[PDB]
Design a protein around this motif. Structure first.
Motif, PDB file in Angstrom:
ATOM      1  N   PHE A  24      15.589  -3.148  -5.145  1.00 10.61           N
ATOM      2  CA  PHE A  24      14.727  -4.211  -5.252  1.00 10.61           C
ATOM      3  C   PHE A  24      15.313  -5.392  -5.713  1.00 10.61           C
ATOM      4  O   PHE A  24      15.079  -6.442  -5.674  1.00 10.61           O
ATOM      5  CB  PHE A  24      13.471  -3.823  -5.865  1.00 10.61           C
ATOM      6  CG  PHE A  24      12.558  -2.784  -5.090  1.00 10.61           C
ATOM      7  CD1 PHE A  24      12.249  -2.866  -3.769  1.00 10.61           C
ATOM      8  CD2 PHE A  24      12.250  -1.593  -5.719  1.00 10.61           C
ATOM      9  CE1 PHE A  24      11.509  -1.952  -3.021  1.00 10.61           C
ATOM     10  CE2 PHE A  24      11.452  -0.713  -5.006  1.00 10.61           C
ATOM     11  CZ  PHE A  24      11.210  -0.752  -3.586  1.00 10.61           C
ATOM     12  N   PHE A  25      16.315  -5.178  -6.727  1.00  2.18           N
ATOM     13  CA  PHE A  25      17.181  -6.176  -7.451  1.00  2.18           C
ATOM     14  C   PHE A  25      18.712  -6.273  -6.933  1.00  2.18           C
ATOM     15  O   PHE A  25      19.419  -7.160  -7.655  1.00  2.18           O
ATOM     16  CB  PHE A  25      17.124  -5.829  -9.081  1.00  2.18           C
ATOM     17  CG  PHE A  25      15.685  -5.667  -9.814  1.00  2.18           C
ATOM     18  CD1 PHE A  25      15.017  -4.905  -9.539  1.00  2.18           C
ATOM     19  CD2 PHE A  25      15.523  -7.013 -10.214  1.00  2.18           C
ATOM     20  CE1 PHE A  25      13.715  -4.979 -10.251  1.00  2.18           C
ATOM     21  CE2 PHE A  25      14.361  -7.007 -11.060  1.00  2.18           C
ATOM     22  CZ  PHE A  25      13.296  -5.794 -10.987  1.00  2.18           C
ATOM     23  N   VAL A  29      15.737 -12.826  -4.303  1.00  2.00           N
ATOM     24  CA  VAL A  29      14.376 -13.000  -3.848  1.00  2.00           C
ATOM     25  C   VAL A  29      14.284 -14.082  -3.224  1.00  2.00           C
ATOM     26  O   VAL A  29      14.579 -15.291  -3.668  1.00  2.00           O
ATOM     27  CB  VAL A  29      13.524 -12.854  -4.944  1.00  2.00           C
ATOM     28  CG1 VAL A  29      12.064 -13.112  -4.742  1.00  2.00           C
ATOM     29  CG2 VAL A  29      13.591 -11.694  -5.999  1.00  2.00           C
ATOM     30  N   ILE A  33      10.106 -13.351   1.099  1.00  2.00           N
ATOM     31  CA  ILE A  33       9.378 -12.172   0.459  1.00  2.00           C
ATOM     32  C   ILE A  33       8.504 -12.131  -0.496  1.00  2.00           C
ATOM     33  O   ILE A  33       7.749 -11.257  -0.910  1.00  2.00           O
ATOM     34  CB  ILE A  33      10.832 -10.914   0.118  1.00  2.00           C
ATOM     35  CG1 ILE A  33      11.511 -11.419  -1.038  1.00  2.00           C
ATOM     36  CG2 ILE A  33      11.328 -10.886   1.251  1.00  2.00           C
ATOM     37  CD1 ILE A  33      11.820 -10.309  -2.009  1.00  2.00           C
ATOM     38  N   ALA A  34       8.677 -13.133  -1.345  1.00  2.00           N
ATOM     39  CA  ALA A  34       7.785 -13.580  -2.486  1.00  2.00           C
ATOM     40  C   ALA A  34       7.370 -15.171  -2.487  1.00  2.00           C
ATOM     41  O   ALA A  34       7.884 -15.942  -2.642  1.00  2.00           O
ATOM     42  CB  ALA A  34       8.669 -13.398  -3.828  1.00  2.00           C
ATOM     43  N   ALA A  76      11.276 -11.358 -13.136  1.00  2.00           N
ATOM     44  CA  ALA A  76      10.577 -10.348 -12.282  1.00  2.00           C
ATOM     45  C   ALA A  76       9.010 -10.192 -13.237  1.00  2.00           C
ATOM     46  O   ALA A  76       8.148 -10.014 -12.659  1.00  2.00           O
ATOM     47  CB  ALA A  76      11.190  -9.040 -12.174  1.00  2.00           C
ATOM     48  N   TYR A  79       7.227 -13.515 -12.609  1.00  2.00           N
ATOM     49  CA  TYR A  79       6.561 -13.691 -11.317  1.00  2.00           C
ATOM     50  C   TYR A  79       5.317 -12.728 -11.109  1.00  2.00           C
ATOM     51  O   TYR A  79       4.387 -13.092 -10.592  1.00  2.00           O
ATOM     52  CB  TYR A  79       7.663 -13.713 -10.229  1.00  2.00           C
ATOM     53  CG  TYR A  79       7.020 -14.103  -9.079  1.00  2.00           C
ATOM     54  CD1 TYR A  79       6.507 -15.557  -8.429  1.00  2.00           C
ATOM     55  CD2 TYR A  79       6.850 -12.893  -8.186  1.00  2.00           C
ATOM     56  CE1 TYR A  79       6.103 -15.474  -7.010  1.00  2.00           C
ATOM     57  CE2 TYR A  79       6.213 -13.163  -6.985  1.00  2.00           C
ATOM     58  CZ  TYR A  79       5.881 -14.320  -6.474  1.00  2.00           C
ATOM     59  OH  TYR A  79       5.202 -14.532  -4.994  1.00  2.00           O
ATOM     60  N   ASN A  80       5.726 -11.453 -11.175  1.00  2.00           N
ATOM     61  CA  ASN A  80       4.990 -10.187 -10.770  1.00  2.00           C
ATOM     62  C   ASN A  80       4.076  -9.846 -11.849  1.00  2.00           C
ATOM     63  O   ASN A  80       4.145  -9.799 -12.834  1.00  2.00           O
ATOM     64  CB  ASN A  80       5.973  -9.245 -10.353  1.00  2.00           C
ATOM     65  CG  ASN A  80       6.892  -9.226  -9.401  1.00  2.00           C
ATOM     66  OD1 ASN A  80       6.676  -9.492  -8.104  1.00  2.00           O
ATOM     67  ND2 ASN A  80       8.131  -9.739  -9.649  1.00  2.00           N
ATOM     68  N   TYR A  86       7.700  -4.091  -9.279  1.00  2.00           N
ATOM     69  CA  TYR A  86       8.886  -4.996  -9.530  1.00  2.00           C
ATOM     70  C   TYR A  86       8.613  -5.320 -11.218  1.00  2.00           C
ATOM     71  O   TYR A  86       9.748  -5.237 -11.768  1.00  2.00           O
ATOM     72  CB  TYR A  86       8.589  -6.309  -8.774  1.00  2.00           C
ATOM     73  CG  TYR A  86       8.530  -6.102  -7.305  1.00  2.00           C
ATOM     74  CD1 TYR A  86       9.658  -5.439  -6.691  1.00  2.00           C
ATOM     75  CD2 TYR A  86       7.348  -6.222  -6.721  1.00  2.00           C
ATOM     76  CE1 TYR A  86       9.394  -5.023  -5.347  1.00  2.00           C
ATOM     77  CE2 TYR A  86       7.341  -5.970  -5.126  1.00  2.00           C
ATOM     78  CZ  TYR A  86       8.408  -5.471  -4.734  1.00  2.00           C
ATOM     79  OH  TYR A  86       8.460  -5.188  -3.565  1.00  2.00           O
TER      80      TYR A  86
HETATM   81  C1  LIG Z   1      12.836  -8.623  -7.680  1.00  2.00           C
HETATM   82  C2  LIG Z   1      11.414  -8.997  -7.073  1.00  2.00           C
HETATM   83  O1  LIG Z   1      10.558  -9.493  -7.946  1.00  2.00           O
HETATM   84  C3  LIG Z   1      11.111  -8.851  -6.004  1.00  2.00           C
HETATM   85  C4  LIG Z   1      11.785  -7.788  -5.000  1.00  2.00           C
HETATM   86  C5  LIG Z   1      11.202  -7.655  -3.771  1.00  2.00           C
HETATM   87  C6  LIG Z   1      11.439  -7.166  -2.563  1.00  2.00           C
HETATM   88  C7  LIG Z   1      12.791  -7.255  -2.032  1.00  2.00           C
HETATM   89  C8  LIG Z   1      13.065  -6.649  -0.836  1.00  2.00           C
HETATM   90  C9  LIG Z   1      12.227  -5.544  -0.326  1.00  2.00           C
HETATM   91  C10 LIG Z   1      11.019  -5.551  -0.911  1.00  2.00           C
HETATM   92  N1  LIG Z   1      10.542  -5.944  -2.056  1.00  2.00           N
HETATM   93  C11 LIG Z   1       9.919  -8.409  -3.940  1.00  2.00           C
HETATM   94  N2  LIG Z   1       9.000  -8.394  -3.115  1.00  2.00           N
HETATM   95  C12 LIG Z   1       7.621  -9.226  -3.697  1.00  2.00           C
HETATM   96  C13 LIG Z   1       7.726  -9.568  -4.866  1.00  2.00           C
HETATM   97  C14 LIG Z   1       8.670  -9.432  -5.944  1.00  2.00           C
HETATM   98  N3  LIG Z   1      10.000  -8.911  -5.399  1.00  2.00           N
END
Ligand SMILES: CC(=O)c1cc(-c2ccccn2)c2ncccn12
Length: 114
Positions: A24-25, A29, A33-34, A76, A79-80, A86
């Motif tokens: 995921f890291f 990003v 995806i975000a 991370a 934002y999340n 995450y």
């Molecule tokens: C690192 C991060 O904040 C992240 C990686 C991903 C992520 C990256 C690739 C596949 C699935 N998830 C993500 N998706 C939604 C919101 C935040 N993220």
């Protein structure tokens, strides 16, 4: 092609990446995806970017590397939401790196370089 500092940083980065088996890291990003990510996060960072910087010999010190690692985790957690994978994984990685790269650990390493 490598130097002692590059080999030490590759070691720290490999140990941090073990905590993120799904990757995921591993890559940047994107806004795809975000939603709105580039509006909220000013200075994006990820493990792939850090590897490239090590290979190019961009880091002069453990402090410079540690700063990018913390930036990645801090983005991370900003934002999340706290209930997401995450956020929780970023908190795990942050704890791991602070332990691994503490001043106490670095001191022991410096004493062994005699
Ligand atoms: C690192 C991060 O904040 C992240 C990686 C991903 C992520 C990256 C690739 C596949 C699935 N998830 C993500 N998706 C939604 C919101 C935040 N993220």
């Amino acid at each position: 092609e490598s130097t002692p500092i590059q080999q030490l940083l590759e070691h720290f980065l490999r140990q941090l990446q073990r905590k993120d088996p799904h990757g995921f890291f591993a890559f940047p990003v994107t806004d795809a995806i975000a939603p709105g990510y580039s509006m909220i996060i000013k200075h994006p960072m990820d493990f792939g970017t850090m590897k490239d910087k090590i290979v190019a010999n961009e880091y002069k010190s453990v402090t410079e590397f540690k700063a990018d690692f913390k930036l990645m985790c801090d983005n991370a957690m900003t934002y999340n939401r706290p209930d997401t994978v995450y956020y929780k994984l970023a908190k795990k990685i942050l704890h791991a790196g602070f332990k691994m790269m503490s001043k106490e650990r670095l001191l022991a390493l410096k004493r062994s370089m005699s």
